[PDB]
Amino acid sequence: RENQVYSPVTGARLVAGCICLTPDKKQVLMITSSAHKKRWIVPKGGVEKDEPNYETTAQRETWEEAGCIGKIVANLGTVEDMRPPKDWNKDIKQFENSRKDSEVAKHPPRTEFHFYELEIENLLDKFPECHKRHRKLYSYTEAKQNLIDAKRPELLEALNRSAIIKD
Numbered sequence: 724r725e726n727q728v729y730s731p732v733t734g735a736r737l738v739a740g741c742i743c744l745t746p747d748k749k750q751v752l753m754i755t756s757s758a759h760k761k762r763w764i765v766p767k768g769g770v771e772k773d774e775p776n777y778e779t780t781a782q783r784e785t786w787e788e789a790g791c792i793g794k795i796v797a798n799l800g801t802v803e804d805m806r807p808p809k810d811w812n813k814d815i816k817q818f819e820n821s822r823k824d825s826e827v828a829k830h831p832p833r834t835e836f837h838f839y840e841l842e843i844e845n846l847l848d849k850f851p852e853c854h855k856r857h858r859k860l861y862s863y864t865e866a867k868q869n870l871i872d873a874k875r876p877e878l879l880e881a882l883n884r885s886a887i888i889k890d
């Protein structure tokens with residue numbers, strides 16, 4: 724349902740999510756993608772027209788997707804989905820090359836993400852996507868591998884800005 728919010732500049736879809744950390748900050752909560760059952764990502768979703776701030780969207784999506792309750796302790800700023808469009812696959816032009824580097828052909832981001840760090844206060848056995856997804860705690864190293872395996876570097880950037888212990 725086209726009830727979603729878009730950047731008036733880049734036309735990118737506005738999304739908010741949470742890097743949910745344990746009190747000791749050794750672990751982060753990850754959910755499984757709905758589409759790709761074996762891919763581990765973090766809670767996030769489209770801002771809706773009613774929502775007065777990114778924090779609202781973020782805490783709602785952390786409930787709906789992960790049955791997680793906690794307090795936002797930090798704004799992790801923005802990261803972007805810079806994945807090229809679908810039609811890119813079989814186009815005549817695909818890359819733009821410099822004398823000292825190579826890059827993908829210029830395009831607007833799919834998604835603009837506003838991330839917060841949440842400290843987990845409770846996890847509930849029942850939530851709206853109870854049976855549609857799985858959820859579990861992971862150390863930094865496992866989370867990092869999960870997000871590379873999911874092909875979501877931008878979610879790893881958001882994770883890297885968090886106070887999660889990397890040691």
Ligand SMILES: O=C(N[C@@H]1[C@@H](OP(=O)(O)O)[C@H](OP(=O)(O)O)[C@H](OP(=O)(O)O)[C@H](OP(=O)(O)O)[C@H]1OP(=O)(O)O)C(F)(F)P(=O)(O)O
Pocket residue numbers: 738755756757758759764767768769806833
């Ligand atoms: O399908 C896409 N993105 C969808 C998200 O998939 P992932 O972010 O997991 O890759 C999905 O997230 P989950 O269902 O796995 O949780 C949810 O994105 P969102 O939760 O960040 O909004 C959904 O949105 P909805 O289906 O509307 O909930 C998004 O696709 P669209 O938002 O429909 O474009 C894509 F970007 F077009 P693609 O390149 O992955 O094909």
